[PDB]
From a paper:
The tryptophan at position 46 in KirBac3.1, corresponding to W68 in Kir6.2, located at the cytosolic end of transmembrane helix 1 (TM1), is highly conserved within the inward rectifying potassium channel family, suggesting that it has a critical role. In this paper, we present the crystal structure of the KirBac3.1 W46R mutant channel (homologous to the human Kir6.2 channel) at 2.80 Å and provide a structural and functional characterization using a multi-technique approach. We grew crystals of the W46R mutant belonging to space group P21212. The structure was solved by molecular replacement, and a final model containing 279 out of the 301 residues of the construct was refined to an R-factor of 22.2% and an R-free of 28.7%, with 99.3% of the residues in the final model lying either in the most favorable or in the allowed regions of the Ramachandran plot. The mutation replaces a tryptophan residue that is highly conserved across the Kir family to an arginine, disrupts the contacts between the outer (TM1) and inner (TM2) helices, and creates new contacts shown in our crystallographic data. The atomic structure of the W46R mutant shows that the four R46 side chains point away from the channel pore and are engaged in intersubunit connections with residues Y38 and D36 on the slide helix of the adjacent subunit (n − 1: counterclockwise neighbor chain). The interactions between the flipped-in W46 residue and the two R134 and F135 residues at the bottom of the TM2 are lost in the case of the W46R due to the orientation of the mutated residue R46 toward the outside of the channel. The HDX studies show that the only region that is less flexible compared with the WT structure is at the cytoplasmic bottom end of the TM1, including the R46 mutation, suggesting that the network of interactions formed between the mutated residue R46 and the slide helix increases the rigidity of this protein segment.
Author numbering:
A (entry chain B), C (entry chain B): 23 to 28, 38 to 277, 282 to 300
B (entry chain A), D (entry chain A): 12 to 28, 36 to 277, 282 to 298
The structure:
C-alpha cells in the first residue's frame, strides 16, 4: 500500500555484507584517529613524520590494545587521543558482539507454504486446505496457525470497509511440528465462505492470511511466518498429493503437487 | 484528579517504599557521557592510589597525576605500551586489580549496550480522545491507534478496560476493572491505522451510562496494545489511558486515508461533532 | 519434603560474594600458571629466578593481554603456556560476561504478599481474599494470578491422596499491576470450600497456593512469585484495611493490617 | 515401525532437503576441543601468510613457523609482547586483519558460551510404559513423570496426544492428532512424581478401543511437558512418545514413595499386573 507523511538504520543483511560493513567501520575509525594524531603535529615516537601509514597502524595497535611498543604517544595531546580510542575499541567491541549475539537470535522459521490452497470434499463437507512443512531437522513445538479471511463488505450507514474472519480449523495447533501439516477449514453453515464461489470471492476482493508461530528447538526462541493467498490461488476440486512415500519417507518434491479431475467435454 | 496518567502510568504517590533501569531508558548521547564519565573517574581513583605508594611507575615524572593516569588507561585498556611500566610488588598488585576492573567494565558495557539494543519502542500512536457515536445503529465507544513505522506489527492484540469506583451491598467502595468486548481485538498485519470499537449493548458495563454517570464512578479507560515487531523480531507493548473528559459524545474520527492513496496522521486526532 | 536417591554448581548469590568468587578464580588460575612457568625451569626473560611473584605478575599480564614487555617468554616451552593462557583469559572473559549478562536477566518480581487471607462477605457471599503489591515504580503488565486449594480427599478404591482445585476468582488478570491487588474467591455452591469451616479445612489438611506471573517493564522479561497459606493463616470475618490514604497515596504500612470484630462476651 | 521415536523425535527419512546447532548441543569437553582447535588452525593460517611475505617479523629466526605462529598468538590475543614486532606495510596489514579476527572470535565465543549457559535440560523422567486400568471405576490411560532435581518446576503443563491413522468417507487415509482430556493437566509446584490420567469415558477417542484396534490404526501417544525451572529461571520443554506395545493393559504403577519418607526412582518404571 502507498504511503503518506508524518541514525536509526539498525539493519541486518547478508553474512558476508555484515562482516565487510564491520571491517569498513574499523578502518574509517582508525583513519579518522590517524588524521587527528597528525592534526596535532607528530606526537608518535618512532613514527615517520607527515605519514598516514604510521599514525594509522598506531591507532590499530591502540584501539585493538596491541600496544606493540615501538610506536608510543608523546606528552599530553596524543595521551588524550589514546584514552578516547581505548574507550572507542571497548564500546566498538560491545556494539559488534551486540549485533553479533542479536543476529544469532533473529532466526528464520524455515517454514515452507504450499503454492496454492484447494477446496475439495473432506469428511462429508467442502473444505478449504493448504499445507506447510518444516525445512529443518530440529522440531518446532507448541506451533499454532491462524487462517484469516479478509474481504470487502458494506455496513448500514455505507462506509464500505475491510473485515477479518478467523476461519475455524479442524486443528490449529501441532503439538510437535516435524514433517508436514495440512490445515483444513471445513465450509459449514457457520463459515464466512458458505455458499461462496470462485466468482463471489473475487467480487468481495477476498484474501486468506495464514499466520504461523511456534517455539523452535533449534534457536530456543519463538519463530514466526505468514503467507497470503488471493482467490486466484485456490484450485476448486484440487487434492494435495501424498508426500509420504513408503521405509517411511517425506518427499518435499511432491509438496506443491495438486491433482485435479479434467472433464470429458 | 486522574488515577491513571495518559501514558497508562499510575498517578498515585507511594509511601512505605543499586538502580540499573536508568542506564537502559536514558538518551543515547547521555549514556555515552555516563560510561566515558565512569571511565575517567576510575582511571583517576587508580592514578591517585599509584601516587599514594610513591614513585612505583618506570619513566614517570614524580608526584604527577597525568603520568600515572595515562598509565592507568594503558593498563585498564590492556594497551600496556611498555615504557610507562610498574615497579616491584606494590604497583603490580594494583595492575592485576585494574586488569579485572577493565574486563568486568567491558562485560557490564556489552550487557547495557545489548539490553538497550533489544528493548525497542512500539511504533504506536493513540488517539488523544475517544468517541461514543452510532456504528451499526448502536452507540459504540471508539479510539484508534496507528503504526508510526514502515515495518508491520504482526499478531497484534488490543484490550480496552473500564476501571471505575463501585459500592457493594456491604457498602465497601472499591475500584473494578472490566474488559469491554470489542467488534475486533486482533490485527493479523497492523500496518496503518485501526479503529477499536466497544458496542454498548445491554451486556456492556456502560449500558445506559452518561457523561454524568461515568464522571460519578470516576470511570477511566485503559487501552493495552501488544504485538510482534518484524522491525526488531521482538514483542512490543504500548498502553494509554483516558478520563471521562476525553470522550467526545457524538464524535466521529475523520478519514485519515486522503488521496495518491495516503495516510495523513495530521488528521489522526481530528474529531467531527455536530453543533446546535 | 524429605528426599530419597537415584561440576554442576551453576549458582548465583550476593553481588559482593559473586565479585570475590570471580576475583578468587582469577588469582588461583594466575597462580596455577605461575607454578607451571617455574615447573619448566626459568623461561621468563628479566624474571628473578626461583620466584613466584615474577612468574605470577607475568601470567596476569599474559592472561589480561597487558603483555607489558619487560617479562617475556623464552623459546618453545613457555611460548606454549603463553598460547594456552591467551585462550583461558578470552574464555574466562566470555564465562564472566555470561554469568554477568545472565544475572542481569534473572530478576526479582518485587511482589509483596499479604501475611494472611480473610473470609468475609463481599457482594452478598462469603469470599476468600488475600492481596499483593508491587514494591517497585516500574509497572508489571499482563499479570495473572492462580489461587489453588490443595487438600487430602479419599478415592473409591482407597489410595487416599492429594487433590488440587483452581479456585474461580472474580478477576485473575490485572492488565496493569502498579499499586495493590485484592484477589477474591467467592465461596458459592460450585466452590470446593462451600459449607467448609476453620475445623473442616484443618481436617482435610488444606493449603492455598497463590501463584503470580507478569511481564516486568523493568527487566523486559517474564517474572514469577508464589506464596502458600495454611488454614492457620485465614482470619474468618477479617476485612483488609484500605491502604489508599487521601492527594491519592498508597501506604504499604497498612498492607498487612486486618480489622476483625471482637464479641461482647 | 514407530512413526515417533521414544524421545518424541520423528522417525521418518526426509528428501528434497553453515550449522550452528552442533556447537550449542555438544559435550562441554568436546566444545573446549573445537574452540582451542579453531584457535590453533587460525594462528597457523596466519603464521603461513606472514612467512609467505618474507622476513617481516623483527627478532624472528627466518623461514620459521614456530616464531611467526607465537607472534600471531600475541597479536590475535592483543598481547603484542614488544620484541617479536612486525615490519613495514606488508605485515602491519595482516596485524590489523588479525586484531579483528580475535575480537570477532571473542564475540562468537561469548555468544556460544552464553547460549549454552542458558539452554538448560528439563529435569524430567518419563515412565517407560503406559497402563490402562481402573482408577475411579473407569478404565484410565496413565503414564507418570518425575523431577530429577531438587529445584521445583513451577506452573507445569502436560499434554497427552493420541496420533493415529483414520479413513474419511472419501476414503482418504490420513494421520489425526487428539488431545486426550486429563483428570489434571497442570501442576503448580512439580517437585516429586506426577501420574497423568486420561479417563476413557464415552468422549475419549479410544472408548471401546483394544490392544488390537489401537494396533490397526497405528496409534501412538505423544506426551508434551512444559514449565518454569526455578533452577535456571527459564521455561523448559520435554517430550516422550509411546507405541501400542508400550501399554500394559491392567498395569498399575508401584508406589515410588517408600519409608524415612523417600522417593525410590528405582521403582519408577515398575508396573504390577495380575497373571492367570
Ligand atoms: K605491549
Ligand atoms: K598489549
Ligand atoms: K610492549
Ligand atoms: Mg590487550
Amino acid at each position: 500500500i502507498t504511503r503518506l507523511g508524518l541514525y536509526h538504520d539498525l539493519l541486518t543483511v547478508s553474512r558476508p555484507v555484515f562482516i565487510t560493513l564491520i571491517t569498513g567501520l574499523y578502518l574509517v575509525t582508525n583513519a579518522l584517529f590517524a588524521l587527528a594524531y597528525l592534526a596535532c603535529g607528530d606526537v608518535i615516537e618512532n613514527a615517520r613524520p607527515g605519514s598516514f601509514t604510521d599514525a594509522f597502524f598506531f591507532s590499530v595497535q591502540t584501539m585493538a590494545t596491541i600496544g606493540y611498543g615501538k610506536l608510543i604517544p608523546i606528552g599530553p595531546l596524543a595521551n588524550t587521543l589514546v584514552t578516547l580510542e581505548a574507550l572507542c575499541g571497548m564500546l566498538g567491541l560491545a556494539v559488534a558482539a551486540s549485533l553479533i549475539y542479536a543476529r544469532f537470535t533473529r532466526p528464520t522459521a524455515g517454514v515452507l507454504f504450499s503454492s496454492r490452497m484447494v477446496i475439495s470434499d473432506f469428511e462429508g463437507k467442502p473444505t478449504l486446505m493448504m499445507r506447510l512443512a518444516n525445512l529443518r531437522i530440529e522440531q518446532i513445538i507448541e506451533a499454532d496457525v491462524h487462517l484469516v479471511l479478509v474481504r470487502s463488505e458494506i455496513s448500514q450507514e455505507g462506509m464500505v470497509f475491510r473485515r477479518f474472519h478467523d476461519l475455524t480449523l479442524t486443528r490449529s495447533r501441532s503439538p510437535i511440528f516435524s514433517l508436514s501439516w495440512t490445515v483444513m477449514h471445513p465450509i459449514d453453515h457457520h463459515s464466512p465462505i458458505y455458499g461462496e464461489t470462485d466468482e463471489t470471492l473475487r467480487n468481495s476482493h477476498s484474501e486468506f492470511l495464514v499466520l504461523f508461530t511456534g517455539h523452535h528447538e533449534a534457536f530456543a526462541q519463538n519463530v514466526h511466518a505468514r503467507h497470503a493467498y488471493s482467490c486466484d490461488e485456490i484450485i476448486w476440486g484440487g487434492h494435495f498429493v501424498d508426500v509420504f512415500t513408503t521405509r517411511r519417507a517425506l518427499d518435499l518434491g511432491k509438496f506443491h503437487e495438486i491433482a485435479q479431475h479434467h472433464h470429458h467435454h
